Design a protein around this ligand. Structure first.
Ligand SMILES: [Ca+2]
Ligand SMILES: [Ca+2]
Ligand SMILES: [Zn+2]
Lengths: 608, 320, 47
DNA sequence: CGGGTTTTTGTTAAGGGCTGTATCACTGTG
DNA sequence: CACAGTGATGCAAATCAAGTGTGAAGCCAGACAAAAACC
DNA sequence: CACAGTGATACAGCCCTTAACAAAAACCCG
DNA sequence: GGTTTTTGTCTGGCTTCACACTTGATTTGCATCACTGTG
């Protein structure tokens, strides 16, 4: 520090005289600007910005909200975050990140059961407490040895608490929507919220060791997402919000999770009864909640679409999927669906199913089994979940692709000329089709077909590669035209807005459907004479009506719940306690934090 | 910026003309010293320490080695790390984390094929190049239509290059081990290194779609671990570095990864024979490496213990 | 080696490019990086 | 009200170097 | 006796906020005065 | 039309050097 | 021995940081708990 003055003595004197006669007298500032000049000439902008930060207010320290957002959205675990915090702190000195306990204290604001709320008509059969979080999903079910045995573990939120937590999470999005819609900001009208409920059972989950019931290796998830929010102004309602990615993993919010078999109806009902109870209780009430200094009220309209075909059949009091009555929207037999294939109308509903079950149980006309089933149109159980008649886009695509795959297998051998075939011939057909598919379109043979397989197999190159193995040309042109018709029909029930981006396709859906039906019934009598798939029946009869009724198909699909299922295993393996009596609670909380949208605007703040 | 350049157009001229006289023309360092002395005259000591640290990359900056260490040992992917870096920079204003290209540049120091090494005697049938990296595990196997069909994907390192990188990754560890035993530091005695060889196949690995042969849904991994390093001192043999947790995932360094089936014998031999040839060549030679400013020579002894019974029987003889 | 097998399985989907041609090299590279004492010792900054 | 003076801020082009983003065939829950 | 997680909980320990009057240190002045590595 | 990754590579963008010129804002005083 | 560099000091006077006490009041660190996962 001392032995370096003899080299700057000659120069600092002119430094001060120049600063005095030109700048005014400051020396530190005139040297700072000079050193910034040198640095940014040398192209060391990183160190230049570091010096600017040191001289100005220090930027050290992140907010707990942004720390939690990083730790959650980078798929990080608590231990890894702790050691990253430790190493960063110990190396750089100043504490940049924040302690795990600070993150924990900062995360209760978004979990349900922290915000005050009330209902103008008090909700029936549910408490008015406002500090309820993760409660047991069994709802105090009798676990005594004298009762019906229980073998499930379930952790759940109250549905109203989940809704209010999500609403206060989306508070600022709702306010931004009010601003962008050219309305006011302090308006407190009756908000109408539309939510989607999705339920799908999972398999291949591995039960853990330890004390507990004889829990099965099948899991069932219940989740909800918010699609549309509308407020009334004058004589119309404005769209203050609309979900950008309705099928993403970031919009579905977990609500009730359990480790129970899908078809195990007794425990399914035992766990899902409370949620349906709250649903029916709050379907005719009004929620008053404080939003940024102004109280605002909320209505609720519920649409259930995220159920697959087996779930709908099971929970709507219907028979199995292989029954004569195929469609869960209309009362038509499989055969009659094969002769007509075009004209239908949706006539099934939850109340109609309930009264049909009442008729079935009471037998008020003194009829036999067959006559009573013909009277009830296939209802043999009491439904307990209310869903709207809708089509699941993902599974519709999967089923259609499977049927086309079978069509190709039977066409690469010309079964229309060989009505009788052995098992060996069909196995050879399978082998050659798989080999050529790999060779040409680079698809591996798989036993359970995915949606990527469906999207790739639903191309023109597919029928080209399949057809060059077909000796005849009539089959070539038939498959070509049928595939083109299917590809023209597809974009209607797969787009989030079929009324805007596909107007011509939506208008010509009916003509394409009729062409598809007549082509099947004429050229494919060897596959669709007396039997046709319920998914073809749906795609040819019910899609335009559902489009007109709802507005879109595919935004209400089960893709979001499938992505949540994907996340469930990852969280169970990485971000949850490995114990049988806490894992589901930890998974539920972490999934709620991940799907929370307050942690999501922090990760795209770079675009601001 | 332009106004500052306009106002200070000449002071730069005098300082640059005097830098050529007093020092030689390094304006950045002399101006840094001038700012430090200005702060000292203004009496700011902790701030002066902060500037000294940021120049030395201690108070902030997070030199790319540390960022890469976090990204790898924290199980963060490249995309997630990029999101973290972008959001941290956007919020804090400073550049706490290093960019992806900086991490990639700092990566090459650790990967095989960066350090110069010389063999004495030269290895039999092994090239003397010191820039070999990820080479195909098929070892130039024929893949034409007229010969045996190959349906495997394999990537592997050269054994000598992999061992050079492994030895240099623990350069400071070897120095510390030699210091802790009250030996010298620049000692260049022949190191007797024992390496455990481990190979085990797997099952239930899904095949991807995409270009490539009909590669089966099984994988076989070949990896090596470094147990003990000893140097010859005096009359006896002294130990330097012993692996504290030999059965851990932090010391099973991969050597050759092929996505084939261990039940098959032809493909196994075809992919694994060159590695055995390199091992046999290295079994009777010595390696010279510039180890921390002093050249030191290595000798290697190998033990293939990490095999299960079925693979042992299918490799070295007896029927399955 | 069993722990290495676990690391291989999770790196195959976590931090490796999804392509039959150029995935194995990425797995090998990342595993070599993860098994590096030079990187690992920066995670032990308590002394 | 407007020249006149002083200062700010940008512009022109050939190069160097750091940072940011699009593109490629694929995954995965189904 | 594999070993690195997996997160919530809880208690020991570190840091601090309040008050003013001290000590201790760094540095400014411009100038004079000894060690030390190449000829 | 599922949508958020997965990592390597290449190209675009932006900011420094030279030095003289040009569009523009703030007081002064006839 | 010359020459240049490298440190040393001088006293009055200025700013700048640490501390002297004490009583709570937080905030940070690290072990416990029964478990997974690759075989
Ligand atoms: Ca399912
Ligand atoms: Ca094995
Ligand atoms: Zn129908």
């Amino acid at each position: 520090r001392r032995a370096q003055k003899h080299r700057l003595r000659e120069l600092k004197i002119q430094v001060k005289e120049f600063a005095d006669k030109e700048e005014g007298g400051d020396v530190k500032a005139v040297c700072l600007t000079l050193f910034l000049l040198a640095l940014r000439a040398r192209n060391e902008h990183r160190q230049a910005d570091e010096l600017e930060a040191i001289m100005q207010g220090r930027g050290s320290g992140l907010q707990p909200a942004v720390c939690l957002a990083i730790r959650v959205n980078t798929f990080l675990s608590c231990s890894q975050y702790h050691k990253m915090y430790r190493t960063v702190k110990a190396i750089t000195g100043r504490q940049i990140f924040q302690p795990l306990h600070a993150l924990r204290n900062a995360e209760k604001v978004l979990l349900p059961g922290y915000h005050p709320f009330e209902w103008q008509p008090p909700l029936k059969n549910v408490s008015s407490r406002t500090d309820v979080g993760i409660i047991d999903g069994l709802s105090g079910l009798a676990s005594s040895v004298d009762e019906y045995p229980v073998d499930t573990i379930a952790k759940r939120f109250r549905y109203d608490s989940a809704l209010v937590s999500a609403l206060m999470d989306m508070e600022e999005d709702i306010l931004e929507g009010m601003r962008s819609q050219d309305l006011d900001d302090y308006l407190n009208g009756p908000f109408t919220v539309v939510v989607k409920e999705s339920c799908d059972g999972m398999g291949d989950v591995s039960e853990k060791h330890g004390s507990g019931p004889a829990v099965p290796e099948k899991a069932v998830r219940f989740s909800f997402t918010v699609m549309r929010i509308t407020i009334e102004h004058g004589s119309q309602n404005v769209k203050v919000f609309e979900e950008p990615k309705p099928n993403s993993e970031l919009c579905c919010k977990p609500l009730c999770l359990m480790l129970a078999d899908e078809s195990d109806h007794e425990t399914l009902t035992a766990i899902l009864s409370p949620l349906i109870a709250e649903r029916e209780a709050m379907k005719s009430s009004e929620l008053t909640l404080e939003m940024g200094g102004i109280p605002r009220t909320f209505k609720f309209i519920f649409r259930g679409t995220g159920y697959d075909e087996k779930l709908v059949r099971e929970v709507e009091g219907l028979e199995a999927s292989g029954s004569v009555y195929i469609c869960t929207l209309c009362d038509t037999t499989r055969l009659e669906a094969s002769q007509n294939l075009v004209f239908h109308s949706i006539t099934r509903s939850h109340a109609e199913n309930l009264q049909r079950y009442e008729v079935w149980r009471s037998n008020p006309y003194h009829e036999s089994v067959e006559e009573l089933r013909d009277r009830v149109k296939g209802v043999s159980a009491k439904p307990f979940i209310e869903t709207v008649p809708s089509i699941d886009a993902l599974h519709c695509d999967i089923g259609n692709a499977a049927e086309f795959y079978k069509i190709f297998q039977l066409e690469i051998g010309e079964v229309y000329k060989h009505p009788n075939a052995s098992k060996e011939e069909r196995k050879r057909w399978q082998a050659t089709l798989d080999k050529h598919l790999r060779k040409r379109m680079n698809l591996k043979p798989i036993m359970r077909m995915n949606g990527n397989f469906a999207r790739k197999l639903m191309t023109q190159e597919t029928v080209d590669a399949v057809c060059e193995l077909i000796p005849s040309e009539e089959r070539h042109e038939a498959l070509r035209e049928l595939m083109d018709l299917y590809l023209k029909m597809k974009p209607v029930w797969r787009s989030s807005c079929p009324a805007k981006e596909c107007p011509e396709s939506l208008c010509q859906y009916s003509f394409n459907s009729q062409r598809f039906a007549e082509l099947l019934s004429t050229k494919f009598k060897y596959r669709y004479e007396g039997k046709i798939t319920n998914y073809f029946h749906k795609t040819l009869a019910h899609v335009p009506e559902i489009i007109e009724r709802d507005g879109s198909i595919g935004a209400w699909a089960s893709e979001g719940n499938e992505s949540g299922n994907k996340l469930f295993r990852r969280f169970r393996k990485m971000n949850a306690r490995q114990s049988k009596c806490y894992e589901m609670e930890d998974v539920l909380k972490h999934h709620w934090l991940y799907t929370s949208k307050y942690l999501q605007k922090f990760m795209n703040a770079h675009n601001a």
